[PDB]
Ligand binder design. Sequence first.
Ligand code: HG
Ligand code: HG
Ligand code: HG
Ligand code: HG
Ligand code: HG
Ligand code: HG
Ligand code: HG
Ligand code: HG
Ligand code: HG
Ligand code: HG
Lengths: 336, 340, 333, 326
Amino acid sequence: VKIGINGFGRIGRLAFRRILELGEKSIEVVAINDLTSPALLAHLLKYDSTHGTLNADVSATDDSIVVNGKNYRVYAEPQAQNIPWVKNDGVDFVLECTGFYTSKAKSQAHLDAGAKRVLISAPAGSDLKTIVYNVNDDILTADDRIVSAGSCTTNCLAPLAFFENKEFGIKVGTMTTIHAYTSTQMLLDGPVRGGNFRAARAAGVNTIPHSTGAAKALGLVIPELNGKLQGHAQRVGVVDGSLTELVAILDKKVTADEVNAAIKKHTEGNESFGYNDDEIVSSDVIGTTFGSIFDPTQTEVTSDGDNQLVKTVAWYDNEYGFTCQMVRTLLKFATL
Amino acid sequence: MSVKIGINGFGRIGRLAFRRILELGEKSSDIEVVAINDLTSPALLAHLLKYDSTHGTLNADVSATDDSIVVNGKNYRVYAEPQAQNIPWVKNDGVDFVLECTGFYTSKAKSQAHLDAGAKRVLISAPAGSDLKTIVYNVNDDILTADDRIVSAGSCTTNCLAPLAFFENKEFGIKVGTMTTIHAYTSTQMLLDGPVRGGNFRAARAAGVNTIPHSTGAAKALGLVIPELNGKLQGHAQRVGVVDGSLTELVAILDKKVTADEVNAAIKKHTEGNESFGYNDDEIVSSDVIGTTFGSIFDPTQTEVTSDGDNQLVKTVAWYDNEYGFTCQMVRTLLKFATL
Amino acid sequence: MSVKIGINGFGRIGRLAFRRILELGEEVVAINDLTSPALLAHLLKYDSTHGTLNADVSATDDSIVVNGKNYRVYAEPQAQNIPWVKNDGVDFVLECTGFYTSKAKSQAHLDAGAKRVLISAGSDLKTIVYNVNDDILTADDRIVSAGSCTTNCLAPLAFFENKEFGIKVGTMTTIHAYTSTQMLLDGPVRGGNFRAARAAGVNTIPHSTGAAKALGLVIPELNGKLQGHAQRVGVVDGSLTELVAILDKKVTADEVNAAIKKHTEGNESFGYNDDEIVSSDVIGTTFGSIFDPTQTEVTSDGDNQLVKTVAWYDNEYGFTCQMVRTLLKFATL
Amino acid sequence: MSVKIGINGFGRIGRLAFRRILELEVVAINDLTSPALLAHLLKYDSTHGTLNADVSATDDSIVVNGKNYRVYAEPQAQNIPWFVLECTGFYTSKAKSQAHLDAGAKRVLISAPAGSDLKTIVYNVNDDILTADDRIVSAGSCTTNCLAPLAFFENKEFGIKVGTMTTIHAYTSTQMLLDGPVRGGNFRAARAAGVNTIPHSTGAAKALGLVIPELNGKLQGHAQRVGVVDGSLTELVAILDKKVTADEVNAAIKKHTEGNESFGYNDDEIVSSDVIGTTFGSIFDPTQTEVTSDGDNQLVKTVAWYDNEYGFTCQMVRTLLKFATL
Ligand SMILES: [Hg+2]
Ligand SMILES: [Hg+2]
Ligand SMILES: [Hg+2]
Ligand SMILES: [Hg+2]
Ligand SMILES: [Hg+2]
Ligand SMILES: [Hg+2]
Ligand SMILES: [Hg+2]
Ligand SMILES: [Hg+2]
Ligand SMILES: [Hg+2]
Ligand SMILES: [Hg+2]
């Protein structure tokens, strides 16, 4: 089970780390494609301000990265179709991390170059499947060649909305994610691509509203919720570690203790959707393997007569969590 | 014959109140601080009045004596009485009204002390129970009469949520709502993980490198300010890693079916020329509100209406300087004390 | 009677220059920039470091408006094509892009009508730190460097310390606010530097600087005598320099303090603060450098001595006010 | 049979010592805060992550991986039934720490500077001077454990005539989140830590004499507290007895790092984050070395990183273990 990684950004590198750890106890990466000198790439794989230092020997050569005596070639093709990693290296699936190949059409380029399947790490349209592992990965079939993992937010929200709706019937809901700052943001105020007024502001010293598609597109993952949710984000001054607040009108009348026990059930042995009642904070989830961690301590039911609002919340390592989700799906690709 | 204020407790709010009243003094409001009570050395207080990591350096000449703080050549005595009934500032200095921001006189019964020391009225910078009036300026200040000698300003959050909720209810009717305030870290929080007053596992965590959930009673208590919303709202807080500047999200079920443009138009009219409840549609972020004089600033760009047949959710958002805004609200209430 | 200023590059520094020129009140007439006027007006109006400009700011399709005055914004990628000489009568170009940074390349501005050009950060042109060596400017000068943000802090301290006591050798470390060149999270960066690649908000990060080494351009007696580097730390703005030196005179901290202090009297460029301030207190200050006597330390064991001195600076605002001071002089030579 | 540590004061350092000793002998704890909160803080940490063990509490004890650790609550240490690691900050004297000796403890290791009538030990610099009569030892400070080996080794190779240090240091517990009064009244201690670079006094260099006697009187320094939660670095600028080059200095210092668990080496161009959770008291970084000369006047700058919490604590443990051989 061999992976080629297109784009050795933060998610790309974390996928490397994750597959490496997994491989120590039982799929493997064989090649990477990226414009950066491998020397720097190796450095960024070894040292991480968020995730710590990789316990392994890392070096580079002029065309590769080396870990624990193994050589991982890095190509530098700006057009995916020219990546020779299939004949050259044995690549089965491509993890597509670049943000540039974000549609079925665009990613065909990988197929043209011989890859069996592709997993894109972002929303990539409605003409292919959007998978959140442990929610709708069962809909995968052998025919599925280009797939989308959705977003980091999708992977947190989906299971919460999924099970909440199955227990109680979500009529309508709104979401706010209080999200760590990201690479698309700036250190200091200044112009940015797209020209967005908020995109342009200093990430580390502001709370910054930000648009997401997560909720609005949730129907690609949970079709009965199409048209039922909207949301946005607030970008705040931490490096990593996020949380999502969902507020919904339900079909059923509930208490907070009832909501908590119902959802808890669905976290039992679930590697994608966890549970924590220790009153954690954001830092506590950095480096966790779940795509979403339900926090019963924040559950709130507001009612007067029989107008009811229910707020639930889940934590997530928007980096590491999302990535572990994508690796689960790469793995499910082998079984198709 | 100016309004004369005693400030009890020269902490962050006290100091800002001093600065605001000083600024108003320059184009005379006729309000002035004549005295302070605090147990910290005047030279440290003076240092903290002059320099501030959030709100900048005061453009005034500031120094200390061993019992006062001197500003632009005027002397402001700093009393040091741990018990408020002992502060001699009414007789010594002309104090009319006390601004009480210590956090220790947080009830009608406790603040009686100021009256016993001869203060005409007291404004408490915090929630202070239900046997006195809780006033949010420009929402319910019209309820004040001459018999009100001890008044509560509610909290910083109350001062943000109140007008939003008030005007939204007025226009559309709030059946039920919940709020989440995304809030700058505060004085009560810790720099690093460790034990804390009260024992709370969350309070105990490092504030600059975490998003920390936190309890609030602003929503639950809003009935004190807007009786019709009693028992209609709940909420909480997320403390985030900025020094100042906050926002509240309100999620409500309304009586009317609405659109976003409609909610926006309706709330907007109530911000116009409203010195307490402002408006900004320039797509601002939290630092843009640091230093603003509003108790709450409505942000139309974040409005959201979610609709699936008959069921509707409305989300509105307001920004505030949890320090400066709150404080300018209180100063407005003080000025209003003079009209009673 | 006035000399008309064009600004190439409306980045942080260029916008601060505008605010500074606006504030001095008793004049810019055009801008050149790649970014839409709307975003630029927004970034002029709002700032996470320096606050909200107290002026009416708005934008059009091809300009930004401040207090009823129109400031045309060209969008020419190539400096030689900017037409603000004819169109808007430009006399002087303030150049803050980073892409012209030599006599060679700033010649484009003169090719297009400009009298003089002020840049920031070679050797075939004068580097001017106002109130240290602006005297060397002459009418012959066409292109001049204001030096760097760091140079404008270090120059005056080093000049005056050397003047009074004689610097034999010295090393500096500037504990510096994070900058635009740095990154929010770990990843590849232009140049490829391993430390440049790291998360700036949550690390202390060593950084190469050239200010000490090039100080010779400003204070010829100090050429070859100083070295230094930076540590980039987690604040948006506000920085300090520590200079450690071997001096030709044996001294006490007070001797050093009193000596350096007289050079700050009425000095709008090199100030003095002994109130025990911290970095955020210098944000918004107009000095290129603010001596802090409270941090002065003399270490000695018998006749072997080291002297440590410290100055603070707003690396944004202080540097820019220095550029403004130079602009005022240059333009009217 | 094997050695039983008792920890007085379950603060950040005490807790990290607990964790480190578990990773590698502690049987009881004395702290005035509730076992539940202690438990939560042992399990979760913003800086050092979550403990990979199962932790719980009771009414009088902390439970980990099955084993149970009693938490006594005595404000007077004579009164703790139960070597002692003294982390409290309140027993900062040979005389004060006599209390733990009154309670029957063999030896006491104080995790702070504790005068000159006891020995201050930096493990792997001067731990050899310890003997069976020393019942109360100081481990000096976090900074002391970083500065010591660097200065010791540089001094032994080149001879320091005079030196000054600046440690660029993560913010600490004594500091505040927002501006306001603090105990002692210092104008700078009163200022918001997360958004300032803040000068702070230090005594580590002046006092280095207690660890390295030939350096007595030759060093001074200070700190700049900056906006990160952990991870620090020290710059030393010194006049030496010999002429050198940067390469020479690096080669010379590097050789004392070989197999040195207390003083390490890193030449990958790291940053503060990189040292968090590292086990060394100090890490030499040769990429930052600088020699400045004109004529025959020479200044030498060397730099070492450290985790001011984790390094210090791992240094302390190494000393606790050495107590045993004694
Ligand atoms: Hg990438
Ligand atoms: Hg979620
Ligand atoms: Hg991962
Ligand atoms: Hg609000
Ligand atoms: Hg105010
Ligand atoms: Hg410039
Ligand atoms: Hg300087
Ligand atoms: Hg300026
Ligand atoms: Hg050190
Ligand atoms: Hg440790």
